Write an enzyme that holds these catalytic residues in place. Sequence first.
Site, PDB file in Angstrom:
ATOM      1  N   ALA A  30      12.909  -7.919   6.606  1.00 28.08           N
ATOM      2  CA  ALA A  30      13.244  -7.929   8.215  1.00 28.08           C
ATOM      3  C   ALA A  30      12.524  -8.330   9.349  1.00 28.08           C
ATOM      4  O   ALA A  30      13.456  -9.422  10.515  1.00 28.08           O
ATOM      5  CB  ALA A  30      14.243  -6.872   8.045  1.00 28.08           C
ATOM      6  N   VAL A  34       5.314 -14.106   6.066  1.00 29.69           N
ATOM      7  CA  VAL A  34       3.520 -13.270   6.193  1.00 29.69           C
ATOM      8  C   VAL A  34       3.280 -14.615   5.751  1.00 29.69           C
ATOM      9  O   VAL A  34       3.838 -15.893   5.023  1.00 29.69           O
ATOM     10  CB  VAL A  34       3.468 -12.249   6.075  1.00 29.69           C
ATOM     11  CG1 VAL A  34       2.175 -11.735   5.915  1.00 29.69           C
ATOM     12  CG2 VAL A  34       4.047 -11.197   6.315  1.00 29.69           C
ATOM     13  N   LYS A  49       0.915 -13.199  10.407  1.00 25.91           N
ATOM     14  CA  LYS A  49       2.713 -12.566  10.195  1.00 25.91           C
ATOM     15  C   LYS A  49       3.107 -12.834  11.935  1.00 25.91           C
ATOM     16  O   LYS A  49       2.790 -12.666  13.037  1.00 25.91           O
ATOM     17  CB  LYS A  49       3.128 -11.020  10.389  1.00 25.91           C
ATOM     18  CG  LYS A  49       4.231  -9.914  10.124  1.00 25.91           C
ATOM     19  CD  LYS A  49       4.289  -9.315  10.292  1.00 25.91           C
ATOM     20  CE  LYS A  49       3.630  -7.939  11.345  1.00 25.91           C
ATOM     21  NZ  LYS A  49       4.195  -6.884  10.972  1.00 25.91           N
ATOM     22  N   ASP A 145       8.489   7.311   6.644  1.00 26.21           N
ATOM     23  CA  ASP A 145       9.333   6.450   5.701  1.00 26.21           C
ATOM     24  C   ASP A 145       8.390   5.704   4.994  1.00 26.21           C
ATOM     25  O   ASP A 145       8.284   3.909   4.828  1.00 26.21           O
ATOM     26  CB  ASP A 145       9.671   4.889   6.752  1.00 26.21           C
ATOM     27  CG  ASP A 145      11.273   4.381   6.079  1.00 26.21           C
ATOM     28  OD1 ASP A 145      10.908   4.736   4.803  1.00 26.21           O
ATOM     29  OD2 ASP A 145      11.220   2.938   6.559  1.00 26.21           O
TER      30      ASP A 145
HETATM   31  C1  LIG Z   1       3.756 -10.232   2.571  1.00 27.81           C
HETATM   32  C2  LIG Z   1       3.045  -9.846   1.539  1.00 27.81           C
HETATM   33  C3  LIG Z   1       2.508  -7.997   2.082  1.00 27.81           C
HETATM   34  N1  LIG Z   1       2.421  -7.644   3.353  1.00 27.81           N
HETATM   35  C4  LIG Z   1       3.743  -7.770   4.216  1.00 27.81           C
HETATM   36  C5  LIG Z   1       4.936  -7.083   3.670  1.00 27.81           C
HETATM   37  C6  LIG Z   1       5.447  -6.118   3.863  1.00 27.81           C
HETATM   38  C7  LIG Z   1       7.050  -5.445   3.795  1.00 27.81           C
HETATM   39  N2  LIG Z   1       8.352  -6.385   4.394  1.00 27.81           N
HETATM   40  C8  LIG Z   1       7.179  -7.771   4.285  1.00 27.81           C
HETATM   41  C9  LIG Z   1       6.122  -7.913   4.983  1.00 27.81           C
HETATM   42  N3  LIG Z   1       3.220  -7.715   5.565  1.00 27.81           N
HETATM   43  C10 LIG Z   1       1.940  -7.831   5.281  1.00 27.81           C
HETATM   44  C11 LIG Z   1       1.694  -7.971   6.998  1.00 27.81           C
HETATM   45  C12 LIG Z   1       1.451  -6.583   7.470  1.00 27.81           C
HETATM   46  C13 LIG Z   1       1.112  -6.161   8.981  1.00 27.81           C
HETATM   47  C14 LIG Z   1       0.109  -7.839   9.033  1.00 27.81           C
HETATM   48 CL1  LIG Z   1      -0.274  -7.402  11.143  1.00 27.81          CL
HETATM   49  C15 LIG Z   1      -0.097  -8.877   8.567  1.00 27.81           C
HETATM   50 CL2  LIG Z   1      -0.962 -10.086   9.497  1.00 27.81          CL
HETATM   51  C16 LIG Z   1       0.788  -8.533   7.509  1.00 27.81           C
HETATM   52  C17 LIG Z   1       1.030  -8.315   4.365  1.00 27.81           C
HETATM   53  C18 LIG Z   1       0.041  -8.182   3.882  1.00 27.81           C
HETATM   54  C19 LIG Z   1      -0.811  -7.980   4.484  1.00 27.81           C
HETATM   55  C20 LIG Z   1      -2.603  -8.818   4.434  1.00 27.81           C
HETATM   56  N4  LIG Z   1      -2.569  -9.252   3.081  1.00 27.81           N
HETATM   57  C21 LIG Z   1      -1.214  -9.931   2.228  1.00 27.81           C
HETATM   58  N5  LIG Z   1      -1.252  -9.818   1.261  1.00 27.81           N
HETATM   59  C22 LIG Z   1      -0.338 -10.018   0.256  1.00 27.81           C
HETATM   60  C23 LIG Z   1      -0.822 -11.516  -1.072  1.00 27.81           C
HETATM   61  C24 LIG Z   1       0.004 -11.259  -1.857  1.00 27.81           C
HETATM   62  C25 LIG Z   1       0.871 -10.355  -2.588  1.00 27.81           C
HETATM   63  C26 LIG Z   1       1.085  -9.008  -1.638  1.00 27.81           C
HETATM   64  C27 LIG Z   1      -0.039  -8.644  -1.037  1.00 27.81           C
HETATM   65  N6  LIG Z   1       0.038  -9.163   2.569  1.00 27.81           N
HETATM   66  N1  LIG Z   2       9.860   0.337  -5.668  1.00 26.93           N
HETATM   67  C1  LIG Z   2      10.357  -0.700  -5.312  1.00 26.93           C
HETATM   68  N2  LIG Z   2      10.401  -1.160  -6.499  1.00 26.93           N
HETATM   69  C2  LIG Z   2      11.932  -2.168  -7.185  1.00 26.93           C
HETATM   70  N3  LIG Z   2      12.209  -3.198  -5.064  1.00 26.93           N
HETATM   71  C3  LIG Z   2      11.925  -2.417  -4.591  1.00 26.93           C
HETATM   72  C4  LIG Z   2      11.037  -1.287  -5.123  1.00 26.93           C
HETATM   73  N4  LIG Z   2      10.646  -1.073  -2.937  1.00 26.93           N
HETATM   74  C5  LIG Z   2      11.718  -1.417  -2.461  1.00 26.93           C
HETATM   75  N5  LIG Z   2      12.790  -2.465  -3.547  1.00 26.93           N
HETATM   76  C6  LIG Z   2      12.462  -3.525  -2.944  1.00 26.93           C
HETATM   77  O1  LIG Z   2      12.225  -4.754  -2.448  1.00 26.93           O
HETATM   78  C7  LIG Z   2      13.498  -5.687  -1.968  1.00 26.93           C
HETATM   79  C8  LIG Z   2      12.198  -5.510  -0.217  1.00 26.93           C
HETATM   80  O2  LIG Z   2      12.611  -4.297   0.389  1.00 26.93           O
HETATM   81  P1  LIG Z   2      11.535  -3.869   1.329  1.00 26.93           P
HETATM   82  O3  LIG Z   2      10.466  -4.392   1.557  1.00 26.93           O
HETATM   83  O4  LIG Z   2      11.653  -2.474   1.731  1.00 26.93           O
HETATM   84  O5  LIG Z   2      12.006  -4.653   3.233  1.00 26.93           O
HETATM   85  P2  LIG Z   2      11.471  -5.301   4.354  1.00 26.93           P
HETATM   86  O6  LIG Z   2      12.287  -6.073   5.165  1.00 26.93           O
HETATM   87  O7  LIG Z   2      10.662  -5.896   3.154  1.00 26.93           O
HETATM   88  N6  LIG Z   2      10.627  -4.199   5.017  1.00 26.93           N
HETATM   89  P3  LIG Z   2      10.229  -4.183   6.519  1.00 26.93           P
HETATM   90  O8  LIG Z   2       8.859  -5.203   6.267  1.00 26.93           O
HETATM   91  O9  LIG Z   2       9.334  -2.467   6.940  1.00 26.93           O
HETATM   92  O10 LIG Z   2      11.658  -5.500   7.801  1.00 26.93           O
HETATM   93  C9  LIG Z   2      14.539  -5.050  -1.851  1.00 26.93           C
HETATM   94  O11 LIG Z   2      15.487  -5.499  -2.042  1.00 26.93           O
HETATM   95  C10 LIG Z   2      14.358  -3.556  -2.604  1.00 26.93           C
HETATM   96  O12 LIG Z   2      15.368  -2.823  -3.005  1.00 26.93           O
END
Ligand SMILES: CCCn1c(C2CCNCC2)nc(-c2ccc(Cl)c(Cl)c2)c1-c1ccnc(NC2CCCCC2)n1
Ligand SMILES: Nc1ncnc2c1ncn2[C@@H]1O[C@H](COP(=O)(O)OP(=O)(O)NP(=O)(O)O)[C@@H](O)[C@H]1O
Length: 333
Positions: A30, A34, A49, A145
């Site tokens: 949301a 990334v 990001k 959270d």
């Molecule tokens: C994209 C996968 C995980 N991730 C997220 C998600 C968190 C849940 N909501 C959607 C985005 N935010 C960042 C992230 C958050 C803050 C900052 Cl400032 C930056 Cl740049 C990246 C990273 C991340 C962060 C670092 N490494 C990774 N690696 C991935 C590689 C593929 C498998 C999952 C982790 N993701």
């Molecule tokens: N532990 C879990 N196991 C399975 N599905 C999950 C789990 N936690 C969340 N989900 C699902 O994963 C999807 C992404 O969830 P979520 O990471 O919380 O949203 P987001 O937009 O990426 N968060 P944010 O980065 O804080 O704005 C949704 O469809 C959730 O229902």
Amino acid sequence: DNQFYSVEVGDSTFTVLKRYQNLKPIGSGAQGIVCAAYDAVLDRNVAIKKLSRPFQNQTHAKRAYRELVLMKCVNHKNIISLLNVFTPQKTLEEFQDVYLVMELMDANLCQVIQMELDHERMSYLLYQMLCGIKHLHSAGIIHRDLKPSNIVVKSDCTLKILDFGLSFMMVTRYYRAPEVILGMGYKENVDIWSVGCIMGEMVRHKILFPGRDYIDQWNKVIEQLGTPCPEFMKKLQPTVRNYVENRPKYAGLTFPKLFPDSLFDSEHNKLKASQARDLLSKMLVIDPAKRISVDDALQHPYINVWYDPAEVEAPPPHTIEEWKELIYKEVMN
Ligand SMILES: CCCn1c(C2CCNCC2)nc(-c2ccc(Cl)c(Cl)c2)c1-c1ccnc(NC2CCCCC2)n1
Ligand SMILES: Nc1ncnc2c1ncn2[C@@H]1O[C@H](COP(=O)(O)OP(=O)(O)NP(=O)(O)O)[C@@H](O)[C@H]1O
């Protein structure tokens, strides 16, 4: 600006500093998109990001601003740390996007939950979450959270919490504490419930309380752990108290029943399984007055083996137009 170049990332355009190369989408949510990238200046892989117009509404703005500020007012290896922050836009008038850069991680905790872990890795990850949360608490930051999609890990088992936690958007509640669900007051151990949910999920390989809403969430909690004590009911506001006391009552399940032996060979592992279940039983407590603290969790035998004072006792840390200016000022420093 000659320092930047644009890349097509799905439907989005990533305009980044030329030092970031071979951009690859790795996930979105949301808040933003990334990418993984190679930073030619640091000779390291990074995660980038993009926040598109974070000042667009109160929800995105408050989060982007609070996170930018807190990421500077925090210094710990178990909490996100920025390598870089930039905007390709030159003026406040043109200002649209914020790019944040950190170390590229290998996986999120969701992926780790889908695998079988031994006790050394499981206890080390939980120890790191507790170190991370303890650091936030020492700075007056109470998360509320924590969720596995916002926790990332490396192949060497090192862990980082990506966000700083807690209203209309044109969200995952599974890990929220009963005192958050029921609009009660909260203290530091509100975060211990979320750690319990995560730990429970690491063992079961399934979300403990998969609620579609707060009502459904509350039912799944009471169906498994049982109806809380009358003293907990006494802390609820009259309206919430009447609703909670008029719900179908449940004796609840014991922790051996909740987390059977089947989920856990050697004597070492048998003892560690016994200690993991004892810790789960102390974190997954509805009443925060009876729930273990972050400090006591760190002293628990399951966790205590990793205890390092340098990690646990580390030195502690509007309208659309106003948010636009506040965010821009923070990015420009
Ligand atoms: C994209 C996968 C995980 N991730 C997220 C998600 C968190 C849940 N909501 C959607 C985005 N935010 C960042 C992230 C958050 C803050 C900052 Cl400032 C930056 Cl740049 C990246 C990273 C991340 C962060 C670092 N490494 C990774 N690696 C991935 C590689 C593929 C498998 C999952 C982790 N993701
Ligand atoms: N532990 C879990 N196991 C399975 N599905 C999950 C789990 N936690 C969340 N989900 C699902 O994963 C999807 C992404 O969830 P979520 O990471 O919380 O949203 P987001 O937009 O990426 N968060 P944010 O980065 O804080 O704005 C949704 O469809 C959730 O229902």
